[PDB]
Amino acid sequence: ARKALIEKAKRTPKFKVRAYTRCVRCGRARSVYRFFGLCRICLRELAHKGQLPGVRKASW
Amino acid sequence: GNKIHPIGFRLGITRDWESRWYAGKKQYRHLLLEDQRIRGLLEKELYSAGLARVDIERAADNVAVTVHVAKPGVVIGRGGERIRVLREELAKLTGKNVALNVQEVQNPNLSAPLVAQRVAEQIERRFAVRRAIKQAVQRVMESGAKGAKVIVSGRIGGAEQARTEWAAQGRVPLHTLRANIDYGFALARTTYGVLGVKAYIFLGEV
RNA sequence: AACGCGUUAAGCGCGCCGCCUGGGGAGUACGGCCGCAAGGCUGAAACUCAAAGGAAUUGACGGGGGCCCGCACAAGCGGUGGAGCAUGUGGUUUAAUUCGAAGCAACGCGAAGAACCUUACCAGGCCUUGACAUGCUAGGGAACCCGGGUGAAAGCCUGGGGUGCCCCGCGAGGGGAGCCCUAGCACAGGUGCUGCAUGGCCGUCGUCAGCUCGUGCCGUGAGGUGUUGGGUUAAGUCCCGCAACGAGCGCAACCCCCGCCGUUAGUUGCCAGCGGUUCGGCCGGGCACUCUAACGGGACUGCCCGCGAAAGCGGGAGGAAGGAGGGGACGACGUCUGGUCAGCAUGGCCCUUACGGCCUGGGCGACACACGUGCUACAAUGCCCACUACAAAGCGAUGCCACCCGGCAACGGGGAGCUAAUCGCAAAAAGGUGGGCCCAGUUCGGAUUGGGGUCUGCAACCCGACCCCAUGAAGCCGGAAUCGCUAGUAAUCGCGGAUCA
């Protein structure tokens, strides 16, 4: 149940409580950000290539 | 274990964003989804010319897709056959005014993401991998540079023992910031495994 | 062969003697000679092995030596190990209690959000070209929109609105590009096994001072020199030496945060100065302060004294700051057949009315027990009540909610500001002040169970969070053991954020 699920995520069946998140690149269920629509990995991969405007290597 | 992406380590200086704009916190979300499925579609139908970069600039509904290539021909046709169908295709998902360009790479041997794909093609057609590497490095430094490096992963020759093959010339200080070192990586895909190639070009300084 | 030998030959030669012919069996048995005896000299075989051995590399190791490091010990402060509870794991249990991680480097770890979702597990009802992709054949149907019955839902049965086109066209009508109902074929789907078939990404040795290349020179060769040595450094940092002279990946340097001052800019700041103030920087006025964020200056052992061949070490002044000024990001050739096929990607293997797919209920939350990480404590340098101060970094449109009204309160009715240095979360808390407790299992401690309520959600029995009354358990400082931290650190106090009903 990997493919059947990412497709279940899109539809919104009965009771809106069921509507979970899900990563865009990665079928990722856990660790999924509102701002980017992405997973923790998916994100970090991108951020190094510059495909995310102004998301820079932090340092404080 | 370790060694970080040499692009992510530059961003602030040297390397600039391969997608630069601004957007709000209901919209980054969406403008980002777009930018992938764009670069996703281009990656396919355009491999033929060797798209070593795919910039995107923006202000409001106005996309500045600039494709950088060493062999520009393949993208247009003679006069305008191909370039036509793409403009169509792009805005075929985005109901916005798709403004596509092309730019030239004076020397493809000095564009890493190319150098990587070249060697990944050489492997997919079973050539001596010790050689292909030692050779692709001369190609680069030959055509003027200060330093250059390549790395092929495991299943060399299709052997049940996966190794890792190296070789590189000049200087490559990946630890230094005032550097400018172009990185690219390609997937060879075979009957027995899945190799990986990494390419590094040392260009200028101060 | 190398280590070495070298007129005291192991060199070059001649004479005569003794001796070896792979390892174990075995210096044994038998016979013989000798011996008081113990035993000695002479000395096999069957059977069995793929080697047994010499010198010399490069490592690794030592209950070897030398120089030197690190909260390693030592000096010191606060903790776990004991209680009660929260959380992760072993085990037993179970219809199932899904899988992974295993000394350091697994165990508040994947999990930055399990009531159905999740969800990979079990019981029960169903569905097959399938919930998703690409393409072909065939009559209907070619978009689409609303109900009926049955059921736990899923599913299966079933009643009504009816099509803007290329175009024969007044019209019957008819070719038809989307897109979907249905049969059927090529195919989809699998978190099914293989992290010793793999990519990528991560852990670790270790932020340790190392790991190497080219040429030359040395050795029959593995390999060596360079990169051993003296000085010095956080450092293969630098100096000086030298059959070597250079060079690369490293360290350092360039990049970000905190410190001091300038230049640029004024809806945050300011009686700083006169001005009116219902005394609220509220007001006109004003960038001098404060702040905000953007470009700079400033420190280089440059100055002086001493020690030194030099590198550099110690000491003094100016200075907001020195001898890497305080924190970051950054982690070499490689090691652990390390971790991950369950984020994804991927060779091979295996299942294709089910090892695929949908729902309803359960399970992941079980409990005679065992270990790890944690929270609240056993009290007077304390606990309780009223009043009163001083932060930072962040976050907010079916979001944060000012301010009202009701309720003991949780909350609930109204409703202004806000795209947010202009409104909101918002009170920080410890502290300060004055009132009560008086050494007690207590006004210490808040586990457990009874009763009563609120809010999210379709739904809180298994399983949610809060609020109120009543119950007030064990704990009077913890056996053997065992962790952290060298300065704005330890200790202690509260605030925010990701995930998200």
Curated annotation (Swiss-Prot), chain A:
Cofactor dependence: Zn(2+)
Keyword Membrane assigned: no
Cofactor note: Binds 1 zinc ion per subunit.
Cellular component GO terms held in the UniProt record: cytoplasm; small ribosomal subunit
Keywords: Metal-binding, Ribonucleoprotein, Ribosomal protein, RNA-binding, rRNA-binding, Zinc
BP GO terms, sorted: translation
Residues that coordinate or bind Zn(2+): C23, C26, C39, C42
One annotated GO molecular function: structural constituent of ribosome
Listed InterPro entries: Ribosomal_uS14, Ribosomal_uS14_bact, Ribosomal_uS14_CS, Ribosomal_uS14_sf
SUPFAM superfamilies: Glucocorticoid receptor-like (DNA-binding domain)
One Pfam family recorded for the sequence: Ribosomal_S14
Keyword Signal carried by entry: no
HAMAP family to which the protein is assigned, alphabetical: Ribosomal_uS14_2_B
Family: Belongs to the universal ribosomal protein uS14 family. Zinc-binding uS14 subfamily.
Function text: Required for the assembly of 30S particles and may also be responsible for determining the conformation of the 16S rRNA at the A site. Binds 16S rRNA in center of the 30S subunit head.
Self-association state and partner proteins as the record states: Part of the 30S ribosomal subunit. Forms a tight complex with proteins S3 and S10, which cover it.
Name of the protein in question: Small ribosomal subunit protein uS14
The species this protein was found in: Thermus thermophilus (strain ATCC 27634 / DSM 579 / HB8)
Gene: rpsZ
Swiss-Prot record, chain B:
Top-rank taxon, per record: Bacteria
Every KH type-2 domain range: 38-106
SMART domains: KH
Role summary: Binds the lower part of the 30S subunit head. Binds mRNA in the 70S ribosome, positioning it for translation.
CDD domains assigned to the protein according to its UniProt record, in alphabetical order: KH-II_30S_S3
Cellular component terms per the entry's GO annotation: cytosolic small ribosomal subunit
PROSITE patterns: KH_TYPE_2, RIBOSOMAL_S3
Claim: Ribosomal protein is one of the keywords in the record: yes
Pfam family for this entry, one: KH_2
Keyword field: Ribonucleoprotein, Ribosomal protein, RNA-binding, rRNA-binding
Family to which this protein belongs: Belongs to the universal ribosomal protein uS3 family.
Organism: Thermus thermophilus (strain ATCC 27634 / DSM 579 / HB8)
Protein name as annotated: Small ribosomal subunit protein uS3
BP-aspect Gene Ontology terms: translation
Quaternary structure and partners: Part of the 30S ribosomal subunit. Forms a tight complex with proteins S10 and S14.
Gene Ontology MF terms in the entry: mRNA binding; rRNA binding; structural constituent of ribosome
